[PDB]
Amino acid sequence: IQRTPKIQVYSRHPAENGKSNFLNCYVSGFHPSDIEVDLLKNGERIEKVEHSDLSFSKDWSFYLLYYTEFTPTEKDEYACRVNHVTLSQPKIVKWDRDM
C-alpha cells in the first residue's frame, strides 16, 4: 500500500562556482503524500527551502520539487535528506555535479 520515494539531487543551471544557481531535490513515486525533505549544506539543514504544489502521476504516486538559491563553491558539499513512512532511517543523496 506504501510506496517509497525516488530522489534526484541536481542544480537548475550548469554548476559554476560564484554564480547564483538553484539546488533542487526532486522526490517522486511515493505514497502517502506526507514526506520530510531537507536540503543540507556540509551536513547542516538549509533554512530557506521552498517546494512545488503537490501533484501526482498516472499511477497515483506523488511528486514534489524542493529548491533553494545557492552559490556553489569548490569546498561546499550539498545533499538532500528524505524521511517518509516507508523509510526506517532518513535517506541521504549527495549532490554530484555530474548527475
Partner 1 sequence: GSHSMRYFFTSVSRPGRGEPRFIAVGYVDDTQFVRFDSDAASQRMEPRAPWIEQEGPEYWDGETRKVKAHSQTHRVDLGTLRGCYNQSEAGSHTVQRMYGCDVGSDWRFLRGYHQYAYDGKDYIALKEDLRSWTAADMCAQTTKHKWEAAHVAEQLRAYLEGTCVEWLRRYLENGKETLQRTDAPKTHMTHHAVSDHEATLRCWALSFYPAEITLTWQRDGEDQTQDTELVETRPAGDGTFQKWVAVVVPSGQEQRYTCHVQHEGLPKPLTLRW
Which amino acid, 12? Answer: R
In the list 4, 15, 28, 93, the residue contacting partner 1 (rule: CB under 8 A) is: 28
Asked if omega into 32 is within 30° of 0 (cis), the reply is yes
Instruction: Burial-class residue 25 by CB neighbours within 10 Å (0-12, 13-18, 19+).
Output: buried
Considering only 28-36, 39-47, 74-82, 86-94, which stretch makes contact with partner 1 by CB under 8 A? 28-36
In the list 44, 60, 73, 88, the residue contacting partner 1 (rule: CB under 8 A) is: 60
In the list 53, 73, 74, 88, the residue contacting partner 1 (rule: CB under 8 A) is: 53
| Minimum separation from the CB atom of position 83 to partner 1 (A) | 16
In the list 16, 36, 54, 71, the residue contacting partner 1 (rule: CB under 8 A) is: 54
Residue with cell 554564480: 19
Q: Which of 27, 86, 98, 96 is nearest to 61 (CA)?
A: 27
Considering only 31-39, 40-48, 76-84, 86-94, which stretch makes contact with partner 1 by CB under 8 A? 31-39
